[PDB]
Amino acid sequence: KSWVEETCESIDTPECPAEFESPPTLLFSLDGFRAEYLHTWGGLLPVISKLKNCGTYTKNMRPMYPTKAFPNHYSIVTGLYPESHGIIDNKMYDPKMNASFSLKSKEKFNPLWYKGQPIWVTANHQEVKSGTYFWPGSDVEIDGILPDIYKVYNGSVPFEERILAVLEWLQLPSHERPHFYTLYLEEPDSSGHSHGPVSSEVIKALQKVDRLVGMLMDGLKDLGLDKCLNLILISDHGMEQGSCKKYVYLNKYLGDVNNVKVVYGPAARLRPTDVPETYYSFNYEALAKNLSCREPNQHFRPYLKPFLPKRLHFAKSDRIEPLTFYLDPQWQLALNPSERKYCGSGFHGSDNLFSNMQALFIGYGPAFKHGAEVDSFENIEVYNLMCDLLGLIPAPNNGSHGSLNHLLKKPIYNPSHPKEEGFLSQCPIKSTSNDLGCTCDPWIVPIKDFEDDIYHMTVPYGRPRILLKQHRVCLLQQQQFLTGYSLDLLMPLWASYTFLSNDQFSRDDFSNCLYQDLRIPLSPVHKCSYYKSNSKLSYGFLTPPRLNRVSNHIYSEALLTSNIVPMYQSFQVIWHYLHDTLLQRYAHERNGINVVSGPVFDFDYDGRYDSLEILKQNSRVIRSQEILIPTHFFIVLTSCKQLSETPLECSALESSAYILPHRPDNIESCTHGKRESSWVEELLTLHRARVTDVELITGLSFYQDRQESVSELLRLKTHLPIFSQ
Ligand SMILES: Nc1nc2c(ncn2[C@@H]2O[C@@H]3COP(=O)(O)O[C@H]4[C@@H](O)[C@H](n5cnc6c(N)ncnc65)O[C@@H]4COP(=O)(O)O[C@H]3[C@H]2O)c(=O)[nH]1
Ligand SMILES: *[C@@H]1O[C@H](CO)[C@@H](O[C@@H]2O[C@H](CO)[C@@H](O[C@H]3O[C@H](CO)[C@@H](O)[C@H](O)[C@@H]3O)[C@H](O)[C@H]2NC(C)=O)[C@H](O)[C@H]1NC(C)=O
Ligand SMILES: *[C@@H]1O[C@H](CO)[C@@H](O)[C@H](O)[C@H]1NC(C)=O
Ligand SMILES: *[C@@H]1O[C@H](CO)[C@@H](O)[C@H](O)[C@H]1NC(C)=O
Ligand SMILES: *[C@@H]1O[C@H](CO)[C@@H](O)[C@H](O)[C@H]1NC(C)=O
Ligand SMILES: [Ca+2]
Ligand SMILES: [Cl-]
Ligand SMILES: [Cl-]
Ligand SMILES: [Cl-]
Ligand SMILES: [Cl-]
Ligand SMILES: [Cl-]
Ligand SMILES: [Cl-]
Ligand SMILES: [Zn+2]
Ligand SMILES: [Zn+2]
Structure with missing residues (x-):
């Protein structure tokens, strides 16, 4: 019998094999799995539904802004806002480095981009081993540290092989076996972009990853580990349907200029092309005012970055351009139609409080409650939680330690009110x-x-x-x-x-x-x-x-x-x-x-x-x-x-x-x-x-x-x- 066909039974104590003193934690990302996918198509996903009904779930995990893969994966493992951990988008320009970051450039492996302390570095400092099968930052030497087992990102590796490798890692002897693991899959993000979030292709992608999670759970059961492993099934952000009719082009107001570079999409940013010489002398305010209040019910708004809503916490990085744009739901922005990818595809990046940007979170295992549904929480809170699961003292971060104690059968950390220091x-x-x-x-x-x-x-x-x-x-x-x-x-x-x-x-x-x-x-x-x-x-x-x-x-x-x-x-x-x-x-x-x-x-x-x-x-x-x-x-x-x-x-x-x-x-x-x-x-x-x-x-x-x-x-x-x- 498979794991998904067993009845849900309470795991009040870890039921571990002799070679395991404590259950490991596995962090499992399904890229671009919007929370609503489970709301609507849960009956087609038996494996993920059992994790939800037999585990601890929230209808909406709130991502960080901008709702893109690299900022949010790195936020999950650091507990930091993107503006603090330095990975503010999948593509960045740093004016002090005079360097550009992107996912298909060698700069992705340059440690200078990655600030804060990811959980595998935290674990390393505290004598806990890690095995990562893909995760942003995990193939980069951060603080002189790499995961004990890691894989340089290669999107062509079949999903099955990723799961089997982790299952072999779990069979290593105790003095080499990691205690923290990551798994990452590109679906349903890939199908969401190519075909839209409401498509038969996304449903197929959702069924595929559901069987792959079942493959993981079946492997853990065979190893005698399905009641000795704390699973966090997570996503980085949701997905929206883009339209060519809901795309703002700045050249309508500016003319066909070429002295500015616009990071296109729903969370667009603008900088001069003549960088770094004019990065700080450029007249951003004049540009922002020329782009303000141009249309009735205008669906984009320019913001000098300190003026963005504080709840986004998106300004205290030199990699965040002084001029940003805030976009209505479903809307995107570019300099002109030549400076963007296809305008009709699925997209994400928008306001992290838009419903379709919300992300997945299920916790399952000894540490997590069974059948608990909890209110929404931000993904920066997960770092402290994984620290509690692993016996680690967290690095300073933006999560509020103790704020997720209601997810746990037995809270580890008892928080206190801050002292009055005035x-x-x-x-x-x-x-x-x-x-x-x-x-x-x-x-x-x-x-x-x-x-x-x-x-x-x-x-x-x-x-x-x-x-x-x-x-x-x-x-x-x-x-x-x-x-x-x-x-x-x-x-x-x-x-x-x-x-x-x-x-x-x-x-x-x-x-x-x-x-x-x-x-x-x-x-x-x-x-x-x-x-x-x-x-x-x-x-x-x-x-x-x-x-x-x-x-x-x-x-x-x-x-x-x-x-x-x-x-x-x-x-x-x-x-x-x-x-x-x-x-x-x-x-x-x-x-x-x-x-x-x-x-x-x-x-x-x-x-x-x-x-x-x-x-x-x-x-x-x-x-x-x-x-x-x-x-x-x-x-x-x-x-x-x-x-x-x-x-x-x-x-x-x-x-x-x-x-x-x-x-x-x-x-x-x-x-x-x-x-x-x-x-x-x-x-x-x-x-x-x-x-x-x-x-x-x-x-x-x-x-x-x-x-x-x-x-x-x-x-x-x-x-x-x-x-x-
Ligand atoms: N509007 C729109 N945007 C798209 C589309 N296709 C891609 N995008 C964007 O380009 C980025 C590259 O996606 P990719 O398919 O080439 O690589 C994927 C994946 O291979 C790559 N990646 C994931 N983990 C990585 C890792 N650890 N290291 C390097 N790259 C990694 O991240 C990308 C998905 O994250 P994302 O959606 O936030 O960014 C996308 C996404 O924002 C599209 O069809 N429409
Ligand atoms: C989110 O959490 C971050 C981690 O605690 C926090 O960042 C930290 O901010 C402090 C205060 O600015 C910095 O502390 C030191 O800064 C310089 C040294 O560079 C000194 O001059 C100061 O006196 C102080 O010792 C930390 O360097 C910084 N840590 C990181 C990793 O960025 C953010 O402030 C938090 N964000 C919010 C909105 O609360
Ligand atoms: C900045 O770096 C780029 C490399 O892409 C180089 O072409 C340019 O000359 C550099 N400019 C300065 C001022 O260092
Ligand atoms: C990526 O993985 C595939 C196997 O799935 C392999 O054929 C390819 O060579 C790998 N790429 C690199 C750069 O190692
Ligand atoms: C528009 O930009 C010009 C610079 O090109 C600036 O001088 C002017 O003040 C801006 N207009 C407004 C209304 O701010
Ligand atoms: Ca301040
Ligand atoms: Cl930075
Ligand atoms: Cl950029
Ligand atoms: Cl508009
Ligand atoms: Cl996108
Ligand atoms: Cl536990
Ligand atoms: Cl009271
Ligand atoms: Zn993603
Ligand atoms: Zn994506």
Whole structure:
């Protein structure tokens, strides 16, 4: 009898032959196996269906951007974003190397491309052997290390021979046998490209790899290993149907230029042809602006790379061109029709939250649960998991160690909340009152005399913790919100408040009206007079003064100088619509929301909060005062899973996070032709982010006082919703 015909039985303990002290881990990639293939054609794939039903499965493993083979395979084995591990696409130009990378060039074997630490190198350093039958990077000497057994990539090797070789490796004596293995097949990616994802050729390709996995499982059973091996069946990305009618050609807007090179496809990038001499002097911004808002409902958008949504984490590599393009589902871009492959084939590379880009993940073996279906997770999380399976300490990476513990029968690593590394103080009322130059309207109720339940109301999940190392913060308590105030930057790092479903906003105006918070040092850029007619810059509020839960008028404590941030007039359009219109609707839909908002400073576009050194280099002198202008603003919205519960009494949390670019115009949204502001909601959706994304870029940590385990909270904070096509 074959493995697939046996009944599914629980493997609570590894059932291993005498020559095996612990089960190995095998990482098995089916290139271009989009998650939906199993959703729809599972009945035709008996082998992979048994792995899913007898193992641990997610409907969608989220890939990394761009959704191509080399970035994503190397992300899986490093736990790193492509921008950090250096393999940002299958084809790259490095201006400092003055060298081009591609899959059919000898540069593919040059170790200088491959950063980070792949799991076989991690294993080597910790006395664990590896055998790789193809995997990007595995035929390259990385950190002076090669897998104990490896194969130089050769796509012509029959799939059966690859599986048989691994099965022979598993028969090696213990002192030479690897503990970690890889297998890689080019299908169903090959048929998806040549014939499209919805084709009889892809179905044949899916049946072929299903029989090949069965061949693997049958071999393990013959060796007595089918209950002594942790299998991770995975893919690098999904597949989409391209069209010649959904292809953007830049020469429509630029003319038939030849001084630029465009990496064609859905995640296209642009650089001058005269490199490296002009790689940094080229006027990318002028080119980006010439390509912006040219068509109604334009299906491509130019982005200078720091302006891409942070959730993509696609900017901190010199191999990522300063100009990139973001493409709608099914759409691709090239310089002209001669600079691209066939426009009607299957393709991938698009936004890693598009449903058809989602990837496969099944875990099967002693370590994995039986019949468990788990929420989506990113493939950068798998490196830590394989480390736990192999008894390895992981190298530093972007996965959140412990966030996949719910996949395992018995979690290996027990995660902790990060320590608060800030310096916390109390801010005393010890500021001499000064004229702010404000002209408050008569209906603004002043703060004439400045001199537990409220705390829980404003931070019902616990206050955000300051991860910023040695940063000086004091907590400012108000009746309706809590502020984490930076004494080093003289502006608030976050404000937290709860917006109940029946709470009303005030209609009154409050222009050019502030009250000096006598608990903080007075700065010239705290005053109304500084921003008066300041064409360069205005100010905005973290907590909305119109929200007043007790009284009918403007909430005067929200007018404190500790509650304002520098803010462009252009961004005020977004911020005002968010708070005057969207938040009220979200609170109706969610039965209230808790809100935390604040500034972000990521001037070096690495997705992490900036050092003091970096902030000093990016300060601006405006109206004879040094001022630090945020690069983004964050907002985190939290409510209950059960709609009968208000945010102060959640049995379980629902979280939405956003990292909004703080730009001095709204060219990103193409608003010249618009007479209503719903485009603000589209901008929010595009720039949604994991809670963990916000934590990394602000040095803050949320929800630490909740009773859920740390791993459960990591699951909440790493989640990101998929755009359903
Ligand atoms: N729109 C479109 N794009 C295509 C088509 N055919 C290929 N592409 C693209 O060219 C790349 C080369 O595919 P290949 O068939 O020549 O080699 C395959 C495979 O042989 C190769 N490869 C896989 N592992 C490798 C490895 N370890 N080393 C070197 N090359 C490797 O990667 C390629 C698939 O990864 P990919 O889809 O992200 O990139 C494709 C893909 O993005 C096509 O028909 N239509
Ligand atoms: C994703 O995880 C990466 C690995 O932890 C992380 O990259 C690391 O970033 C730090 C901080 O920039 C670098 O640390 C050192 O950088 C230079 C040395 O080159 C020093 O001047 C610094 O003081 C510091 O010691 C690491 O070199 C870097 N590691 C790698 C492999 O890139 C990324 O930041 C993470 N990405 C996100 C968005 O969180
Ligand atoms: C960059 O490398 C290419 C090799 O493809 C070479 O032709 C060119 O002269 C080099 N330019 C500089 C400035 O080094
Ligand atoms: C690739 O493998 C095939 C066998 O499947 C072999 O004929 C061919 O010579 C190999 N290529 C190289 C460069 O070794
Ligand atoms: C278009 O590009 C030119 C350079 O060729 C630049 O001077 C101009 O400012 C750009 N147009 C816009 C609207 O930015
Ligand atoms: Ca930064
Ligand atoms: Cl790099
Ligand atoms: Cl390139
Ligand atoms: Cl278009
Ligand atoms: Cl492609
Ligand atoms: Cl195990
Ligand atoms: Cl709780
Ligand atoms: Zn692929
Ligand atoms: Zn492909």
